[PDB]
């Protein structure tokens, strides 16, 4: 086993999550079975209690574990599947050892937070890094630990102590620390004193740093690096600069130009880890897929405009997984992406009574879009705008994907505007009216990776061509409310055909509309399973249809 | 006595010197006899050893004390005269107490740096703040101490201890601390953790802060101030923001909008200091002169271009006092200033053999200028360019001021190009040739405020009109080399008339050329004596002649 | 080259000087040419200005450098000769670099205390550790640096930074840090939190510790060591305990039982240093001399009582070198030592008018003594008591040594009480009387190691037998006042024979009285040249005469 801990910061907004998700990617190019752990200093047990307004979207794992965003960034960069244990939190570990007290397992000793709770952290990291994460049950070679918060805090405090002991309870040369740090620029001069005042605290809290990964606004001066290597004890080759480049998928290749694999190969003796040619050649091939997709980003010019239609579009992190899946689908089509933020409530005609500028800008963005996405919203208060965009996408022939709530407004749209029931309703919203035309029903939660089976006649469905025509699809779910299955025999007659269903047959999970270029609902969330080299099939479908050449993508899949 | 200490910083480049020079200005509007002290953590005794390349120009005081730049900023903002004791340094105080050891004055005790050296600091600040600084020998009401370096360093260390004792050895309510601090902005969010990691160190080193003067890139958010007032113990009204505004002469009036006089009047009980109406009404009148000159800057549009002709123009701080004196002269003329940086060596014809672009850009800037300045350079290696600009200024009639070396190249120019001795030379440069046409001689140093007497016939001289026709002028000097007095009887015959001389008659200190709109040499430095409401008379002459209306300025002076 | 820095402390009184003087002794048993450096955070240039009341005696080096006590402890433990450069001080290094500024050697840069002054420290330690110190001009293999003050102070601050850079400017594995630390005991429990709050500061200031040398009141518990090895990163074998044992000459052998040579041999790779058999066998022989002299201390029982007669005897550190030389002489005679503190002014008959108890206790202690010492006092105010003890020692036949002032009161005693001039006087005291019987004269200072030549007839003198009958003696001096050489021809006739003189013949440096068992004056200081295995010959003479068997010691010397 080996560990690399990514850590530090003068400030908590500094962006450690790319250097974690990008260090682990570079180590996966050596062919190593890499894994990752997030530490979050917040008290939440797991993210399911905190709304998407409050620091971004509610992620989903194979377990159903509603979790921190930063798990998702490692899953999509590293190709790995994570579990709800990979998110260490102050909530979890304190709830764990305090529940263990009432169980009695410390034999009625004191449960001081030094010794015993820092021992539970060091045990949890050693459990979790041995859980398998790739397509086979082989245990990881290297674990990337992202230490949330900063080193020099009061929510960080048990973790930085636990990791001082863990620098020895796992031997040095099986552990390395990467310290992210701030180097401000003021009046044209690079200021390395915030960094030198977090190297003092790092040595004090007891870890010793290996890298000094500065988030400067610039290239670091040769004299700036020379002084950081005088005040921190690292050699000047190790003072990596992580400055902005044309997209975040380039960041691994900047770190590779900055020798970071050659340093980590030495500093953790990675030549002593046992690897097969099936490991190593997969490693060096994955490097060439990353060099190819970044070269394709560097000279892709032909734009594709996708309208993302929903509430809270000013909080873009409320959709981080939706955005990132369109970026994967974009780079695979070799069309450059623009996403058009349509704040759905502005499409509703009553907006014309409040501000006409909002009513025109939103319908302008929607009309300009080469493809349309209803992105699995939350709450109900924007729903009429999401219905109008689904009417537009059906009648104007524009490519369409409905995710989760998106499948459900598509059934509501089709009921109101093709089946001809204008009172038909989201039972998710208009409940205590008790009306008969209910497009949905509550069936109290359903979460995690679940099996979707294709219905028998489905051969013609573009969505089934995009899934490689395989009879079953494994994808991640969230929904309380599902389509009322007593309308399905009507929709099945009117050309709205339910391509895919749950294994009991009673629950509807995919539809495709007959006789449209690409119009799909998926009631699972296709966002979360997308990887940077394997875009999620419904999202690859959307960005292909909107680019043209949907047929040529269907060959690239099925060959 | 009262003290305000201006201090702090996450980073040393943060710009405390304006908040010091601008806090003391606001207190002078209450009519208080304000003084100021600079602390510089460097080991230099005094600045005379360190070249103008190395952190800016070599200042001069009335004593001849070659000193830190930051004395100058208080002198010109506050109208005060300082002495070489007002610059506390690590060099000075350690040289003082270690020389005092060999003298024996600690009675053969140990001279630990705690107790005894921190007692010498607390004694020095109490000596120095009682030295008089205004036009009358009245001792100061309030002293502004600017603590150089940062609070949380190893060159700062005896000063922050000395000032912890000084918070009591002078009572609280006779002392206040203003902590300047950094609040970075990253991804659009204001980051108050560098500030909260210098409030921790401040409390630790033992001073307690009063103000939290942030150097953010923005207006501070109401929520940013509320959190800084939660982690520092100041109330939110006291978290002053010191953001950029149209010129640094506005900064006092931003601090006045941010209640800083109303706070300091309370927090130091300044109503208990005895003031006359001659103090108070001078105070409130000086406020209206500052409101008037800042209002004049806000709608002055008519440009005046002054060529500053010399070496090292890329190091603008090598001329900070020259620049600032032109800004005072500008605002008094009500013309907006552009200074044209002419790197003098580019005017020399040999530059045409090296790069024609440099030869044209430099002569273009010089030809475009409404007035010309030879700014008292250092060394000799650009001198031929400074001679060509003096030839141009004489023959093309353009307004001219030569400061120090500027008077001397004007005599060399006039000798080569009007008297007709083309071999005549700077004895400052071409020494061991031993030639007879020496325009200068060494007479080993001459420094500080000295008396210049006008020669008898001088009545017609525009420079004597600008000095109010008063028979003697008191101004600050630096020169090893002076005009060879055996050429003067020739220049006096050719219309180059030496308007002013030293009290012995043997040394030449001012000239004005007959029959030119404004062409002056001054061998003293007129820069250093300029105040923000009293621009230095030769520099007011230059910016007036270049603006036109030199006659109207001569009425504004003599009425 | 190799360095071991001895450092640290929660408190400054903790006793680092034995662990320094005893680590270097253990390394000298490997045969290495060891040297040592003292750092003193005080501002004194050198100790000559600070009186023996103020933190102990005024030491003397071969240079004449009046220096810190702690040089002496290394000289006598390690056999080495030091120079006044081996005492780094805050006074010296700041006086050095600030004098270097007025000389100009930083080329007119800023002389910040970071970079430039910490570079002067790192240069000074690298100069000084290459100066030779043994009987041949071979440069040292290992240097012990004793860091005075504590790590976590403001007088320490440039040294701990300089030593962070010096951990790299000399490579790791050529440097090691030993951190002395406090482990209090309260209510019967060992408290390792003062230690854990100086390991935090050590890591912060940037050095990393190797040893954790606790000054507990007890043996450290196995659980106390296990927790210190959990919070500091050292392994539990390295947490040395330095508790009290029967004399400080045992301390090296406790550290040798605690593996400290086996650890330092590994941690500095001391097997790679080139050694001859003449080095190594001298090393292992010196170990057996230390095992022998400590075994002799463990079962020596026969007491010898030496009266030390002088002022300020309550300040025993005012005589630290005098005490330590008697301990060497004691262990060489194999008699256990008691020193009788005679506060000399109490022997004066006027004390009988003030307190009879003082008059009896002091004469009781003097009468009880097996031998008598006048220990080179300072000032004059106790002199009549020192004369009465010299009268007693001459007439009652008791063994006597006069050091410096001791030789001079012996001449004054002999003049008043054998030559018969009762008005004869110390010209050091009774000056402006201008009397003719002056026993002394001023000849303005005379310091350092000087050559003493024996006068021709001297063969019979016990002092010349103790010096091995060698014609010249090299020993360290301090005296303004010396015996008036115009009395010598009288004393030479009366049996007070001047055995030794300065090379000019004009100055008198040793006498021995004819026809007494052992009665010696030495006007040099014999204390400072004594080593733990080579006691100073006059002091070996005194403790031998007082033990009996002075003849048997004269064989042990001359064989
Ligand atoms: N490989 C990555 C990593 C991060 N991000 C972006 O980074 C964001 C949030 O910043 P991040 O780098 O994850 O760190 P912070 O949120 O600043 O938090 P912390 O510094 O506490 O880890 C999201 O907007 C996401 O789009 C990204 O686009 N690609
Ligand atoms: N740990 C440190 C670093 C620097 N200094 C001193 O503080 C002065 C001012 O600090 P600065 O020169 O700004 O050093 P930097 O570390 O570069 O600060 P910044 O990065 O903000 O420019 C330096 O000249 C130096 O003498 C200090 O006392 N302690
Ligand atoms: N009233 C003021 C104060 C400062 N400056 C400008 O500020 C400069 C240098 O910055 P300063 O504010 O004096 O502080 P720093 O040099 O950053 O140093 P420190 O923060 O260590 O005090 C010069 O360029 C000067 O033109 C100015 O124009 N007007
Ligand atoms: N002294 C502090 C301040 C904050 N926190 C914790 O650290 C987390 C991340 O710090 P941050 O939210 O960034 O707080 P700020 O002080 O604003 O940091 P910055 O100014 O850099 O944004 C906070 O949610 C809080 O729980 C802490 O442990 N100790
Ligand atoms: N080998 C040694 C070392 C020290 N001492 C005794 O130790 C004394 C002073 O304490 P020391 O151990 O030298 O250290 P401190 O004075 O406590 O100072 P510091 O801890 O600052 O080094 C003297 O009384 C001296 O007799 C000794 O007898 N033998
Ligand atoms: N660095 C540390 C060490 C201990 N503790 C906590 O503080 C409690 C009380 O400290 P103590 O048990 O006394 O630990 P020691 O380090 O042994 O303190 P001392 O040596 O003074 O007994 C411990 O139970 C532990 O939970 C802590 O918070 N931080
Ligand atoms: Mg925050
Ligand atoms: Mg993050
Ligand atoms: Mg700097
Ligand atoms: Mg400044
Ligand atoms: Mg003390
Ligand atoms: Mg000591």
Author numbering:
A (entry chain B), B (entry chain C), C (entry chain A): 1 to 443, 456 to 571
Show sentences the authors wrote:
CTP synthase (CTPS) catalyzes the final, rate-limiting step of de novo CTP biosynthesis (Lieberman, 1956). Each CTPS monomer consists of a glutaminase domain and an amido-ligase domain connected by an alpha helical linker. Glutamine hydrolysis in the glutaminase domain produces ammonia which is transferred through a channel into the amido-ligase domain, where it is ligated to UTP to form CTP in an ATP-dependent process. Budding yeast have two CTPS isoforms, Ura7 and Ura8, which share 78 % identical residues.
We determined structures of CTPS filament bundles formed at pH 6.0 to better understand the mechanisms of lateral assembly. As we found for the single filament structures, Ura8 reconstructions went to higher resolution (3.3 Å for substrates and 3.7 Å for product) than Ura7 (6.6 Å substrate and 7.0 Å product). The Ura8 substrate-bound structure had the same architecture as both Ura7 bundles, but the product-bound Ura8 structure had very different interfaces between filaments, giving rise to filaments in register. To better understand the nature of lateral assembly contacts, we built atomic models into the two Ura8 bundle structures. Ligands were clearly visible, and bound as in the single filament structures, and the longitudinal assembly interfaces were the same as observed in the single filaments. Yeast CTPS has a 7-residue insert (residues 273–279) in the linker region that mediates the bulk of the lateral interaction in both bundle types. In the product-bound structure the linker inserts near the tetramerization interface and packs against Pro236 and Ile225. The buried surface area per tetramer at lateral interfaces, 2202 Å2 (substrates-bound) or 1676 Å2 (product-bound), is comparable to the 2460 Å2 involved in longitudinal filament assembly contacts, suggesting that lateral association contributes to the overall stability of the assembly. Propagation of trans interactions in the Ura8 product bound structure with filaments in register also results in a curved sheet, but propagation of cis interactions results in a closed tube with nine filaments. Conversely, Ura8 forms bundles with radically different architectures dependent on whether substrates or products are bound; it remains unclear what the functional consequence is of having two distinct bundle architectures.
